Ligand binder design. Structure first.
Ligand code: MG
Ligand code: MG
Ligand code: MG
Ligand code: MG
Ligand code: MG
Ligand code: MG
Ligand code: MG
Ligand code: MG
Ligand code: MG
Ligand code: MG
Ligand code: MG
Ligand code: MG
Ligand code: MG
Ligand code: MG
Ligand code: MG
Ligand code: MG
Ligand code: MG
Ligand code: MG
Ligand code: MG
Ligand code: MG
Ligand code: MG
Ligand code: MG
Ligand code: MG
Ligand code: MG
Ligand code: MG
Ligand code: MG
Ligand code: MG
Ligand code: MG
Ligand code: MG
Ligand code: MG
Ligand code: MG
Ligand code: MG
Ligand code: MG
Ligand code: MG
Ligand code: MG
Ligand code: MG
Ligand code: MG
Ligand code: MG
Ligand code: MG
Ligand code: MG
Ligand code: MG
Ligand code: MG
Ligand code: MG
Ligand code: MG
Ligand code: MG
Ligand code: MG
Ligand code: MG
Ligand code: MG
Ligand code: MG
Ligand code: MG
Ligand code: MG
Ligand code: MG
Ligand code: MG
Ligand code: MG
Ligand code: MG
Ligand code: MG
Ligand code: MG
Ligand code: MG
Ligand code: MG
Ligand code: MG
Ligand code: MG
Ligand code: MG
Ligand code: MG
Ligand code: MG
Ligand code: MG
Ligand code: MG
Ligand code: MG
Ligand code: MG
Ligand code: MG
Ligand code: MG
Ligand code: MG
Ligand code: MG
Ligand code: MG
Lengths: 257, 158, 134
RNA sequence: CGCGACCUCAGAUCAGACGUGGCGACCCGCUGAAUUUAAGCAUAUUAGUCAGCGGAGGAAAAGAAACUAACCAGGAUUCCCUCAGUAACGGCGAGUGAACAGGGAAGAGCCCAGCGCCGAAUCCCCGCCCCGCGGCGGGGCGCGGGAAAUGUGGCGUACGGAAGACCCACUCCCCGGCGCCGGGGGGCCCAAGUCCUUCUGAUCGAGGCCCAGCCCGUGGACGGUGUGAGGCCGGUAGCGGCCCCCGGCGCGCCGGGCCCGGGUCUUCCCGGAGUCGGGUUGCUUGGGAAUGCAGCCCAAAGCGGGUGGUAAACUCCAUCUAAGGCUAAAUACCGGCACGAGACCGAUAGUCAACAAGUACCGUAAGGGAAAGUUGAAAAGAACUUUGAAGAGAGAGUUCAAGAGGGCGUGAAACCGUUAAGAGGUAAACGGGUGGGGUCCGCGCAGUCCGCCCGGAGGAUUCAACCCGGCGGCCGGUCCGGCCGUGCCGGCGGGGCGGAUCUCCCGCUCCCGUCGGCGGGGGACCGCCCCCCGGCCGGCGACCGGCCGCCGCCGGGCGCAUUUCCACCG
RNA sequence: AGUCUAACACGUGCGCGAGUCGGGGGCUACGAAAGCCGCCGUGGCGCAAUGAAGGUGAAGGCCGGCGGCGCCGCCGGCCGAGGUGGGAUCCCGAGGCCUUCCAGUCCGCCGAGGGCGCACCACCGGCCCGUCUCGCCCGCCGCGCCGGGGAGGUGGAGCACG
RNA sequence: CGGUCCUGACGUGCGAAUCGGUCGUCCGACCUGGGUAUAGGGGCGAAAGACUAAUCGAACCAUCUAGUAGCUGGUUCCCUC
RNA sequence: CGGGCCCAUACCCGGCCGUCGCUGGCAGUCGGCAGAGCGAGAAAGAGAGUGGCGCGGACGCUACGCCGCGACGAGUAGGAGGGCCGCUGCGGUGAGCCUUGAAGCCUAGGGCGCGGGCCCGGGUGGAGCCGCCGCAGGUGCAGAUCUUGGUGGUAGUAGCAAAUAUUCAAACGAGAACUUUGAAGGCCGAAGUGGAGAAGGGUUCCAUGUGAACAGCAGUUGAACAUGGGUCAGUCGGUCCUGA
RNA sequence: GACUCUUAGCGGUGGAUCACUCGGCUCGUGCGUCGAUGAAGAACGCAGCUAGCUGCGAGAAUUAAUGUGAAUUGCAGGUUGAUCAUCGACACUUCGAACGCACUUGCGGCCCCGGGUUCCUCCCGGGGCUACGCCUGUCUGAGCGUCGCU
């Protein structure tokens, strides 16, 4: 709010006596705005309780190590059909979830042939879901250039540009991404993991070099290696019903008394 | 009023500090403007090094840093007259000069003389009238190959 | 998506500009599509409406297939009047009902030198655009 | 006495110029409080801050050491990080409080006076002629007039300079005009459904448009149009088009200024005074036996002078050269001209001001200062009949809606009128428990069903088994073939990365083609990783192919009715 | 009508870890976002304390001999980074857990008694800096108002495998 | 021109000081219009701390200022321990 | 002094709700490839080996889940936990809702929750709205002689009482206590309730028309409202002079 | 039956809520421009019917020119370019630093024109000048200021 908002007037309290409530009153004058009440959050006009300031801490700071951790986690989640379908993508007819296409796709220049590529890959149902999801936002956001809303669709990752963004940018819900500049804001929209991804062969090959392997550290990072696992075998049922463990237990008590 | 075990503090907020609060919301805009001006200057000075003139080897002053070298203001007049370059020609051909610098030992002087000789063997000179070459001017074979270099001209590494 | 950093997506700014446009911009806003036959024979999709063009009404209570001649173009209220699109008042006077030019299709243009110049300019622009595209 | 010079000083409506005042967000120079904190209060703090005065610009100010340092030294100014809440200051209380070095953004240096040497070699103005002319300039001509020797111009400034001599080298600089070669402001333009049917007062709604899943898409931002539109309109994308005007980077031409350098040796030359510094007083600073500034008094020197954070004498070093001047960039911006955006407010909010808002109004004046948005898609804003003087009604009509009738979207509460019901001498009202009556609900009014079996009536492509074909699940103690390892061992293999692990040549400098030094390139070794080959371990339950075996399911036959299944009845 | 900014303290969650952090700078519609830099880690905090300051700056013992029993140095070699008590857990195991009865084999379990002891707690020793007392030895480019060392008390926001 | 007494009227009045009767002076230190001078820690005062635009034992206007208050008033949903 | 009797939220038995504790139980749903168990006073095996037809078996386990045993339940100032309590905006999600009707509003309608509150039905209304996972905040009122706006009882009440006073007839007019005309009776009484100016007001002055609003009753009237008109200088004054 | 209370329906008063938004607030970008050649600000006037707001200046809701190309509109009126936008030519009332002296809009002076005169003076109208400080140059001067000649 304006720093001088609610302080334009010259007003002083009427003091004790005169059967008024000791709030400041506007000074004199033959008008309705006269002896009415000027300063204070409870008065009509005048300042509010704690006027907002521009030097509120707007931005935040996150460590690079855990930013890269989050990117790795999002990429790992984006390769599980259960997680992708839970996020809601219509990937049922998709041949293989880490969808990789050849490098000829990166040379497309027509939205028509991009649409044909999507139809052949059988990812068109997700864009049709986006079309269904296009509706009008609720609340006072319409008056602030946030009138229309829609669902996020599949994400395209390219190694380098030869018209791929020109071809795909018109289609709704498609997010074009450089492999070397992945951001969690577009990889994991809304704070949830498992966005449907379409890769190109060159970007898919380069990703390994980008983030390093378990044995080989990342070469395009000055010093980075993949985060480790606190527990390896996550198949809890398999662990529980194994001979070595099942041997060393006491007999269960399931007699309700 | 202090309460229990704490650390008593002295905040310097007793002046009219809210009247002077310099925010940094225009920081990305300033970075963009600086980079754009940098590119404009680099493209304006077409073949010359983008990082301006060469600069000499300098020891840091105090005992805390006197084991490190860095880039100084300009070459000293003793270094110029030992290298053979003229005071008023060095700046034209792209060498930083300052008449303030003294030379208290021969090692720094010789290191800077060798650096000047390397730079002088390294640069390429253009004919200010292209249709007429001159004596110390280079030939078209390297005139075709001349290009700008990024960063400092001859990096100073200890 | 709009990429030009010098035009607004601001709803308020667009509304203010539209409702405060001067007359020579009102003329550009008041454009109607030519019929199928005229569009085919001129390679031009739309033409700002004029005072004496034969038109049809495509939407509303007065929609039909009758050919009506424009009477006046009332740029202040963003409506145009046609020669037989009118209702009956209480006393017995017939007044015209305004219709927006975007809901009206032009049937026969009023040709003069400047109108012909506009048509040939638009045709040349579409021809060069098609040559570039193909 | 008169006349003529110079010097100081006057009057001009003399010829030609210049200043004044405004805004003031940012900047420069003065002046300068008190609320407040110290739990009182006087030093201190608030605070060199508000108020007051003066002066500018597109930025201002500062700025090329009378510097920092004490190191193997750095090197104009300005800004950012850090130094650092540190050294220091403080009724040593409350509180206050820098700088150096380091890393960066930017990066550019110069000019006088003085000492000297050049026949004042210098500048301004009036008149003619030629050209240029909306930044009053270039050239030729005047026995034209002034300024200036009480000092103009050239060379020259602390980084040394000048002159002479001896060697080497050079004819690539700039401008006044002309002509030619390819970012800014403006204007006009450039894709595709009003397709079929069906909702509505009105469609922009809903369904469809095949095997080209209607059409365009480098255009699916937005706004308008009778709700809710990528394709109706303006627009949006495009190194898309055309048409106007302006600048720079280049080109040759005509003319103009200037005939310009470096190295060595020698001889000469070399600096800013009521200023520095000292005493005292007052303010100021973190600056403390005085950081900076100012007043008064004293008042310099030239191997001098200042500084070297504790006063003073002596003695050595280090470091600059004050008392004259100019200078872009990085930097600041709540005013102004245009803009773009927002996890902001949504008419008691957001600016006081969404509207004829600094307005109406109030005060003698300085000044104070509001309330106030919404008919409908379109006025289609109610013709006409009738009672009344009329406001105002009853009919008629528009509209989808007057249940939208000109302060008219929706229309709550307080408060009021009327209708219906109930009740009424301890003010009303309230909690617990019942009873009575109402308005409504159950669309209650013949009451639940769901499986197995027995019996009675019926009807089927109809069960089991078998054959063919397809798919799937589990296996082969130890089927054949693959892939993978946060697996390993082999290698007379081929490499990329790294090492504060070693050691052939090149560049630099130190020597009378040489001994020996430094930097760099070349190779060895070690460690990691990728790839080609081989051999074992494990996995394929985050990671399988074929064959065989069993089982399961499905489709089709063959089965034809004591089987199986459908619907009724007791 | 308990808000925002800054500081601090503790408690919780996350990443890395004796290290950690680019926040300033730089390179590449949403995007003023994001990604990257390592000879951009300058720097901050931590890895060392103590003294006003000049300064100093965190284990010892044994074996055998020479000299001035023991102690010191030349030596060589070896052990080598505390102890006591309580300590969750872990380790060993006198014997034993039946289907007729005997013997003995493998797996598993229970258990008298006995141990190696995490973290932490108490106590006792030890080491570093300041200070005090008592004392004699050692070194040399400068033999000195030089430098170094020991024994015993005591002061510290210390060390004692981060 | 002024304002004694009725301590009368009125006292949400005719009036934020008015009304009635009764009263003081009425050639003077007299009453009065316009012009003019004196401005806030100042003026001016036959002096009551009187007057200085309904405000005077320090006017009024804006700002410093959202001045401080160990002191009054208020402080917004539920359940569970 | 004796028997009997009456009742508190106390005590006993029983049901239900929550909290605490057992840091209790359950991965064993191991099914024709099968063999149903771990609750019972007293440690530890439904231990392994070596020699003497018919194709069948309920629910369960959002493990942040479900289930079982006991005990316990006051509360201001204050602390903490849980909210599938509530409000506004943002990122994801609901192939969500919506002109065959959104928000909002009213409701003697049906219900759910201990509660905060919520969901349906009816009416009105006419264009947008919501559920779940996270994020953010100018986020919840009965009070502050609180601010702004509106409305009550008082209440058709107090009041429309300073200065002597009205009456008859007619005219216009829809309408006359108040307008006008005529007549009568009165007052101011020449220091006036008269005739004219200065300061100040600024069109109030004049004619016509109207009677929405105003003139504290009414008005045919007005200093109201709307149309139009009106201020004439050498000799009135400013202009000129000087005074404090 | 009156009056009073509660409840509901309807109708009043009132403008809450909801939905709208040519308005603000905040951030960022580019530019970063007043005046004696008369600024900011004030006053008064201008439309066929016009009060306020807006625009304009006796050429007064605008002229000229360029671009666009058939309107403005509440009511009248009469394409060889209506209306808009741009804006480079022209024009721009009285005050205001405000400039002849004062601030009534009062009083002048000098010069040149047309009426008068037939310049002979008056008088009328019009036009151009008539401020302070200051720089350079010019003209006219002053001084028992320093001199030189006679
Ligand atoms: Mg406000
Ligand atoms: Mg809402
Ligand atoms: Mg406390
Ligand atoms: Mg564009
Ligand atoms: Mg003159
Ligand atoms: Mg000025
Ligand atoms: Mg105090
Ligand atoms: Mg106090
Ligand atoms: Mg006090
Ligand atoms: Mg003080
Ligand atoms: Mg101070
Ligand atoms: Mg100030
Ligand atoms: Mg300016
Ligand atoms: Mg400057
Ligand atoms: Mg200098
Ligand atoms: Mg620190
Ligand atoms: Mg200070
Ligand atoms: Mg520095
Ligand atoms: Mg730089
Ligand atoms: Mg000179
Ligand atoms: Mg629309
Ligand atoms: Mg459709
Ligand atoms: Mg459409
Ligand atoms: Mg649209
Ligand atoms: Mg179009
Ligand atoms: Mg278009
Ligand atoms: Mg001070
Ligand atoms: Mg100087
Ligand atoms: Mg200087
Ligand atoms: Mg943006
Ligand atoms: Mg309102
Ligand atoms: Mg408001
Ligand atoms: Mg409202
Ligand atoms: Mg509201
Ligand atoms: Mg309204
Ligand atoms: Mg509307
Ligand atoms: Mg309706
Ligand atoms: Mg309505
Ligand atoms: Mg309404
Ligand atoms: Mg009622
Ligand atoms: Mg009744
Ligand atoms: Mg802590
Ligand atoms: Mg009295
Ligand atoms: Mg009385
Ligand atoms: Mg009374
Ligand atoms: Mg005085
Ligand atoms: Mg008196
Ligand atoms: Mg007294
Ligand atoms: Mg005072
Ligand atoms: Mg206050
Ligand atoms: Mg107290
Ligand atoms: Mg019980
Ligand atoms: Mg109890
Ligand atoms: Mg309790
Ligand atoms: Mg609507
Ligand atoms: Mg908010
Ligand atoms: Mg309330
Ligand atoms: Mg009465
Ligand atoms: Mg009366
Ligand atoms: Mg009388
Ligand atoms: Mg009279
Ligand atoms: Mg009179
Ligand atoms: Mg009259
Ligand atoms: Mg009346
Ligand atoms: Mg006369
Ligand atoms: Mg006079
Ligand atoms: Mg009710
Ligand atoms: Mg209202
Ligand atoms: Mg309304
Ligand atoms: Mg007018
Ligand atoms: Mg014109
Ligand atoms: Mg024209
Ligand atoms: Mg006068």
């Amino acid at each position: 709010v304006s720093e001088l908002a609610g302080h334009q007037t010259s007003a002083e309290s009427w003091g004790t006596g005169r059967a008024v409530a000791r709030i400041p009153r506007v000074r004199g004058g033959g008008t309705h705005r006269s002896g009415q009440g000027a300063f204070g959050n409870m008065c009509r006009g005048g300042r509010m309780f704690a006027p907002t300031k521009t030097w509120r801490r707007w931005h935040r700071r996150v460590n690079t190590t855990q930013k890269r951790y989050a990117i790795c986690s999002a990429l790992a989640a984006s390769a599980l059909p259960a997680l992708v379908m839970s996020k809601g993508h219509r990937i049922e007819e998709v041949p293989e979830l880490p969808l990789v296409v050849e490098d000829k796709v990166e040379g497309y220049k027509k939205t028509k042939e991009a649409v044909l590529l999507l139809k052949k890959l059988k990812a068109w149902n997700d864009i049709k879901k986006v079309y269904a999801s296009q509706r009008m936002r609720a609340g006072k956001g319409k008056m602030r250039n946030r009138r229309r809303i829609q669902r996020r669709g599949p994400c395209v990752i390219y190694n380098e540009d030869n018209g791929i963004v020109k071809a795909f940018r018109n289609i709704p819900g498609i997010t074009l991404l450089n492999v070397t500049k992945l951001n969690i804001l577009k990889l994991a929209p809304g704070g949830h993991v498992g966005r449907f991804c379409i890769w190109t062969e060159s970007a898919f090959r380069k990703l390994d070099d980008l983030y390093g392997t378990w044995r080989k550290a990342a070469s395009l990072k000055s010093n980075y290696n993949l985060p480790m696992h606190k527990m390896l075998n996550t198949d809890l049922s398999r662990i529980l019903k194994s001979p070595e463990i099942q041997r060393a237990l006491r007999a269960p008590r399931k007699k309700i008394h | 009023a202090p309460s229990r075990n704490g650390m008593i503090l002295k905040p310097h907020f007793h002046k009219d500090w809210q009247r002077r609060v310099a925010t940094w919301f225009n920081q990305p805009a300033r970075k963009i403007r600086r980079r754009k001006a940098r590119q404009a200057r680099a493209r304006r000075i077409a073949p010359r090094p983008a990082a301006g003139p060469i600069r000499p080897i300098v020891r840091c002053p105090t005992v805390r840093y006197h084991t490190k070298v860095r880039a100084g203001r300009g070459f000293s007049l003793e270094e110029l007259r030992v290298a053979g370059i003229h005071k008023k020609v060095a700046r034209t051909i792209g060498i930083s000069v300052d008449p303030r610098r003294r030379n208290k030992s021969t090692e720094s002087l010789q290191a800077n003389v060798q650096r000047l000789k390397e730079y002088r063997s390294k640069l390429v000179l253009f004919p200010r009238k292209p249709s007429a070459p001159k004596k110390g001017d280079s030939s078209a074979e390297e005139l075709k190959l001349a290009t700008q270099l990024t960063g400092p001209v001859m990096p100073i590494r200890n | 998506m709009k990429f030009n950093p010098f035009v607004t997506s601001d709803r308020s700014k667009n509304r203010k500009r539209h409702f405060n446009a001067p007359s020579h911009i009102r003329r550009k806003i008041m454009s109607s599509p030519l019929s199928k036959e005229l569009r085919q024979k001129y390679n031009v999709r739309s033409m700002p409406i004029r005072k004496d063009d034969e038109v049809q009404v495509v939407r509303g209570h007065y929609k039909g297939q009758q050919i009506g001649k424009v009477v006046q173009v009332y740029r202040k209220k963003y409506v145009i009047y046609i020669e037989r699109v009118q209702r009956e008042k209480a006393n017995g006077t017939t007044v015209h009902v305004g219709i927006h030019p975007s809901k009206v299709v032009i049937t026969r243009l009023k040709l003069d030198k400047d109108r012909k110049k506009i048509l040939e300019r638009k045709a040349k622009s579409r021809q060069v655009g098609k040559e570039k595209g193909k």
